[PDB]
Design a protein around this ligand. Structure first.
Ligand SMILES: [Cl-]
Ligand SMILES: [Cl-]
Ligand SMILES: [Cl-]
Ligand SMILES: [Hg+2]
Ligand SMILES: [Hg+2]
Ligand SMILES: [Hg+2]
Ligand SMILES: [Hg+2]
Ligand code: NA
Length: 305
C-alpha cells in the first residue's frame, strides 16, 4: 500500500475479521443476480469472479446470522448494479429515465411486495432485496431503514444533476464513494446483524451515536485521501490535512469505543433484557470497529482490479 495511503494504526490495532459464512455467499448471490436478471449472465460472472462488495460486508457484519449476511451481501451486489445504471444514465444524459427510476425506488422501498416483478429488473431486484431485509426485525426498524434510504436515493439524484453539469464527484471498478452515501443504512444494518432492534434511547446514547458516526466518517475521509494522489494520472500538504482527519477519526473512535463499551456494561444489569441489549451494543460497536479494517483492506485489494 502506498505510503501516502498507509495507516499503520489500522494495520496494528484493527486486526481483520472474516465471517465464517463467507465461503457460502458467492454461489447464492450469483444465483440471485441471475434469477432476478439484474445483469446479463456475463456481467454477473465478471462481478462474481473476484473481489466484490460481499468481501467488504463479510469483514464488517461479524456475528450476523447466515440469512442476514446473505441478505446484506445480495443488497451490496444490488448496489453495484444501481451504481452502473446511475453511471449509464448520467453518461447518456437520460434525465427522464433516471427521474422515473428514482421515483420507482422510493415507491418500491415503501412497498416492495408489489414490485417484486417490476418490468425494470433493477427495481424488481431492489424490491426483493428490501423485502428480505424487512423480514428480520419489527416494522419500526423497517420504517427507519426506509426513512434513511429515501435520503440515499435523493443523494444519488443530487449527484446525477451535479455530474450532468460537468462536476466530477470522484472511474473505479469497486468504488466506495457512493456506498458512503448509505452511511446511516450501514449503521441500521448492524441491528439485524446482532438480532435486535435497539431502542431509541440506546442507539441515540451519545457514545453509541458518536462511535457510529466516526466509523462511517472514517471511510468518507479515507476515500478523499485515496482520491488525491490519483490527481497525477499543494498535493503533499493537501494529503497532509486529509491524513490528519483520517487519523483523528480513528483515535476519536478508540476513545468513544471505550465509552460505548462502558455503556454496554451498564446495560448488563443481570436481567435477560439487559443482557440482550448489552450484547447487541457490544456486537454493533465491534462491527463499527471492523468497518475500519474491512474498508482499509478492501480498498487495497480493489486496487488489483
Ligand atoms: Cl456474486
Ligand atoms: Cl475508501
Ligand atoms: Cl475530523
Ligand atoms: Hg460477489
Ligand atoms: Hg433487543
Ligand atoms: Hg480509500
Ligand atoms: Hg475525522
Ligand atoms: Na451516518
Amino acid at each position: 500500500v502506498p505510503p501516502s495511503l498507509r495507516l499503520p494504526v489500522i494495520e496494528a490495532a484493527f486486526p481483520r475479521q472474516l465471517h465464517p459464512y463467507w465461503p457460502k455467499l458467492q454461489e447464492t448471490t450469483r444465483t440471485w443476480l441471475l434469477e432476478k436478471r439484474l445483469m446479463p449472465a456475463d456481467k454477473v460472472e465478471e462481478y462474481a469472479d473476484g473481489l466484490c462488495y460481499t468481501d467488504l460486508m463479510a469483514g464488517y457484519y461479524l456475528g450476523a446470522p447466515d440469512e442476514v449476511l446473505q441478505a446484506i451481501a445480495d443488497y451490496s451486489a444490488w448496489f453495484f448494479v444501481w451504481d452502473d445504471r446511475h453511471d449509464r444514465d448520467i453518461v447518456h444524459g437520460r434525465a427522464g429515465a433516471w427521474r422515473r427510476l428514482r421515483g420507482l425506488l422510493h415507491t418500491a422501498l415503501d412497498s416492495p411486495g408489489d414490485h417484486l416483478h417490476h418490468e425494470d429488473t433493477l427495481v424488481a431486484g431492489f424490491a426483493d432485496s428490501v423485502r428480505r431485509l424487512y423480514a428480520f426485525l419489527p416494522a419500526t426498524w423497517n420504517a427507519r431503514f426506509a426513512r434513511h434510504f429515501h435520503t440515499v436515493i435523493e443523494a444519488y439524484d443530487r449527484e446525477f444533476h451535479n455530474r450532468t453539469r460537468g462536476i466530477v464527484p470522484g472511474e473505479e471498478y469497486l468504488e466506495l464513494r457512493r456506498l458512503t452515501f448509505a452511511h446511516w443504512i450501514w449503521t441500521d444494518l448492524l441491528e439485524p446483524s446482532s438480532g435486535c432492534e435497539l431502542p431509541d434511547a440506546v442507539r441515540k446514547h451519545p457514545a453509541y451515536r458518536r462511535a457510529a458516526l466516526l466509523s462511517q466518517e472514517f471511510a468518507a475521509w479515507y476515500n478523499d485521501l485515496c482520491s488525491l494522489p490519483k490527481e497525477i494520472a499543494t498535493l503533499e500538504e493537501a494529503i497532509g490535512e486529509v491524513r490528519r482527519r483520517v487519523e483523528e477519526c480513528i483515535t476519536e473512535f478508540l476513545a468513544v469505543e471505550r465509552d460505548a463499551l462502558r455503556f454496554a456494561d451498564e446495560l448488563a444489569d443481570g436481567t435477560v433484557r439487559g443482557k440482550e441489549l448489552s450484547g447487541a451494543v457490544r456486537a454493533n460497536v465491534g462491527n463499527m470497529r471492523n468497518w475500519f479494517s474491512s474498508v482499509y483492506w478492501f480498498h487495497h485489494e480493489s486496487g488489483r482490479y
